Every structure is written in C-alpha cells, then in structure tokens.
Design a protein around this ligand. Structure first.
Ligand SMILES: O=C(CS(=O)(=O)O)Nc1nc2ccccc2s1
Length: 154
C-alpha cells in the first residue's frame, strides 16, 4: 500500500516478536512482503536490546519460521507511522491508549491481536513464567490471529 503493522507486548521478547515473525512469513508466502512494513515493540523498557527469549526461538525453529529481532520500546513516532498496532492483553492496550493520547498524530488503530481470533481467545497471555507449551499456545494464537488480520482488518 504500503501497509504497516506493529505488534506490541510488555517486553518485546516473547509474544510480539513471534507475532511479527509469523505475520512476515504469511505475507512473504503470498508474495506481498514488499507491500508491508512489519515490526514489533514493547510497552516497557525491561528488555531493550535483547533478542527473543530462546524458548520462543526453539518454538519458531520447530515450525520453520525465521525470527530475528532486538527488543525496542514503542515511541511517539510509531503512533504516527503505523496503520495498526496490535497488542496482546488488556494491560498493553491500556498502556498504548495512554501513550497515544500524549501525541498529536495517531494514525494507528490500536487493538488486541486476539480480537481477530476466529476461536475468540481474546488475550494472548505472557509465557515468560510458563513452559514450552505456553509458547506453543502463543504461536498458535498468532497464526490464527495474523491470518484473519491479513484477510480483513477491522
Ligand atoms: O517480557 C516478557 C514477555 S513478552 O511481553 O515479551 O511476551 N514478560 C516479562 N515479564 C517480566 C517480569 C518481570 C520483569 C520484567 C519482565 S518482562
């Protein structure tokens, strides 16, 4: 379009780097990655500079999905440049809305990624203190939500 989407979670080391990687693969598989700007960022500064939690890498390797990212915090600019900001839970959503009201230009539509899930699992829960099966759940949620978002944005 070019179209753009920013996936957001608390740390940008587990949920949103997986979502970003899943989405980039989907558009690359459909020959339209050049039409999309895809990224991920954190609401917080807890993990800035760090790559995805290696448990998430292990999950993505199993599914054949390339993932390469260094954590960064969302900035005021992101609200002006992204068409969609898709986040994981209600705390992310609250924080993003708070930040968005501090800027003059907010192009982005800010929503829960789970609002796209055909299976209606609204919240994508933080797997950091969970186990490998929690990362797998997060992955599967991202696949379903990302596919539906690409098909038709709200
Ligand atoms: O970073 C993530 C996961 S994700 O938001 O990247 O999916 N979860 C955190 N839990 C904590 C808990 C304590 C301190 C810092 C952090 S960071």
């Amino acid at each position: 379009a070019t179209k753009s989407v920013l996936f957001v979670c608390l740390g940008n080391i587990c949920r949103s780097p997986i979502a970003e990687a899943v989405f980039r693969k989907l558009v690359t598989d459909q020959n339209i990655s050049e039409n999309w700007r895809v990224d991920s960022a954190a609401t917080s500064g807890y993990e800035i500079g760090n790559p995805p939690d290696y448990r998430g890498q292990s999950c993505m390797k199993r599914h054949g999905i390339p993932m390469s990212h260094v954590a960064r915090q969302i900035t005021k600019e992101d609200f002006a440049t992204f068409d969609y900001i898709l986040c994981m839970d209600e705390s992310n959503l609250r924080d993003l809305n708070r930040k968005s009201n501090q800027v003059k230009t907010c192009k982005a539509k800010i929503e829960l990624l789970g609002s796209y899930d055909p299976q209606k699992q609204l919240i994508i829960e933080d797997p950091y203190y969970g186990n490998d099966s929690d990362f797998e759940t997060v992955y599967q949620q991202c696949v379903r939500c990302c596919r539906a978002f690409l098909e038709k944005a709200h």
